[PDB]
Amino acid sequence: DNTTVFTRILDRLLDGYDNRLRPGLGERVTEVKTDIFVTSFGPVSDHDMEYTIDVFFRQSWKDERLKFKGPMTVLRLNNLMASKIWTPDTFFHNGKKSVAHNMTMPNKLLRITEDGTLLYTMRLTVRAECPMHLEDFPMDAHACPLKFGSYAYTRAEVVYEWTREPARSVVVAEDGSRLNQYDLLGQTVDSGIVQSSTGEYVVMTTHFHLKRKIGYFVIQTYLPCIMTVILSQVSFWLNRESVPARTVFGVTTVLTMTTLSISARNSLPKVAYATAMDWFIAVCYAFVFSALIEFATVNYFTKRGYAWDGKSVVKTFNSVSKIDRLSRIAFPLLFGIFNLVYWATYLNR
Amino acid sequence: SFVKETVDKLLKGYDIRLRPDFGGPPVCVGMNIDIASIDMVSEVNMDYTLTMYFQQYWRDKRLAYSGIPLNLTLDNRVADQLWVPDTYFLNDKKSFVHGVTVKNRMIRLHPDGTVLYGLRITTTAACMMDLRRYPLDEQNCTLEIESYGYTTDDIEFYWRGGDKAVTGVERIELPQFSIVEHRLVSRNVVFATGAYPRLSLSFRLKRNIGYFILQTYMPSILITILSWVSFWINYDASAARVALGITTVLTMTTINTHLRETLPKIPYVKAIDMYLMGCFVFVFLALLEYAFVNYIFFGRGPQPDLTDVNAIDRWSRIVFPFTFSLFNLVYWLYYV
């Protein structure tokens, strides 16, 4: 008869207990005290405008029907006991497909203190929404929210409130990051109220602030577009009698920019506007488009269809074009001036 | 307390296998939808994902309680011990009630017997899309709400508040589409077993055009124009006027091959296949133009316009920028 004492305590707490009734249903509100330990702020999917987060979602409230007097001041109980006790119906207001883990047992802990103050944590994998404003893509930033509250119990029944000065009640584990593309700069904790069709609800809010590292798109998009415009500007330095060769510059670099302008918007939501990367490609497409219209003008004024033999001085040969002597300077300059206005408009904000 | 005895009086001998007024009048289940979001509208799978707060009001005289002035908002697990209607969705491919941190249900008993049964349902409803005008088309996506086991002799549906039933449509900002209007239709349908009530929430998804210009149209214009450089190059440059048209029929192929990867296998000609086959002709005729020139000067040489070699180029510098501008004027006024 060793463990019969704690069995007698647990059976006494569940005799007149009804797990369908809020503590103080016609008496007072139920102040639920929350806490979040973000273990790993998982990978942000741009194509779905979502993100993944792995939290230890803590809760705490006072149930006066669970007072006891025993050898211990706190009952570190099993997760089965939580299904027989009223737990608040907290859902996430922007969750898409969130998982309450149960490997190998349901990952819940219930700790009944001697005066009724409960503690109830869960290990969740919330796949939440994040409305993105991809106008400054990829040099932009987002404030992805994580918003939770009660589903059935209104403002006059269950009131959520953060513990211990809310700005430090959502802590992020330093080990788990899981952000390959973005960069977590810090969180902002707030609290609000909805006006649904059924009543006012108390809504907690944690905005995680992100910042996309642009190191990927420089390698994959910006440098193949810059090195293509330079290849279109190689053709100004050839002679004008090499029409079957300066054509190959001005057309294949259009085929290169066509390949880049199609495969740049992969893994993106098909938005109804031009991103900041689209304002780079469509201008770099215009330095390659105009590098062939330039050669169509030089070919239009070429009289003699034969190159300089070498053993002569200016038979009559074609002089070096006055359009080429200008466009060897203007096209590398006007591309470099645009390449300063572009990276100063967007890297300053 | 007093409430714990009152709820047990409501659920003592409460038979959940029996409809309210099981031998009498039909029960009037009034519905109410608060749409959270529309996640993804996919043309490849011909469906759309809808997340909503789905609510139902009916009254049940077995759940009437007196004395307590409050609306008894119970735990969600009592909904497994009550009668709830077996309403389903015909368009439903794959749906689930959200179960974090609990299964998101609600039971709000009212002291006259009125029952609120709210759900947070993420359903993947189906739309067969008419892509003949793609990507310049409107759509019509519905959500066919219907009872399964109760005919119109047993149950009746109605939207609550009339047109103010479905809310949260104006909050929806789809990146691809744009919601024009939504309608609320209440009717009855007849199967081989009986007449069932049916509600339907329809939409009008008008597609935005700003993506497909920068993706498909505006490249295909500026590549059709670069087939016109050959009319300014002299006809002696055989390796140059060929390398224009040969690279340009490759480039119109790569636009076509990198488009069918993200698009279903529909048999009919879309409005974007009519355009990319349309711009393929102006590219292909600009290369047949050179072989028409190269045959006259070198094959017909030794032995509209005349058969002069310079005259055909000076003719083609005017006609093809005029015909292709005429092609876009017919195209962007027939579909827009």
């Epitope: 929210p145 918003k147 902002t188 609000g192 909805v194 006006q195 809010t205 | -």
Partner: nanobody, 123 residues
Framework: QVQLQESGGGLVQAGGSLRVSCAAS????????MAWFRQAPGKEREFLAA???????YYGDSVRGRFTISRDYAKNSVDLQLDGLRPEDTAVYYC?????????????????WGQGTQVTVSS
């Protein structure tokens, strides 16, 4: 260009309600956070109210329970039900809109701003 045109009222009796509105044009703000602010003479911009996309009302701690923000997602606007106007609320009310990066309380996160509305509470 995006114009956040405002309306509302200038003068009110101390103990009288008021309704200050803010229509928008040039951009659909159905995905942004449209907020209100307050700038007393000789004092910085003070946060009053904000509503997110999901109809979530974020109030200031000094003004909670008095004011009531309400958006109209169809007409692309935002409203602020002034109620219980003490004489310490005489300032210029601004209408903001932004994504709230390091924000929702910080005034430096709102990219689009209104003109201002002088609200005078007389006792």
């Amino acid at each position: 260009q995006v114009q956040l045109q405002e309306s509302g009222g200038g003068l009110v009796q101390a103990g009288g309600s008021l309704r200050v509105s803010c229509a928008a044009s040039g951009r659909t703000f159905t995905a942004y956070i449209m907020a209100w602010f307050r700038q007393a003479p000789g004092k910085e911009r003070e946060f009053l109210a904000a509503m997110d996309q999901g109809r979530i009302q974020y109030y200031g701690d000094s003004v909670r329970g008095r004011f009531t923000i309400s958006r109209d997602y169809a007409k692309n606007s935002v409203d602020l039900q002034l109620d219980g106007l003490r004489p310490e609320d005489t300032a210029v009310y601004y209408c903001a809109a932004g994504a709230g990066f390091w924000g929702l309380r910080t005034a430096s996160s709102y990219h689009y701003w209104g003109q201002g509305t002088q609200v005078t509470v007389s006792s």
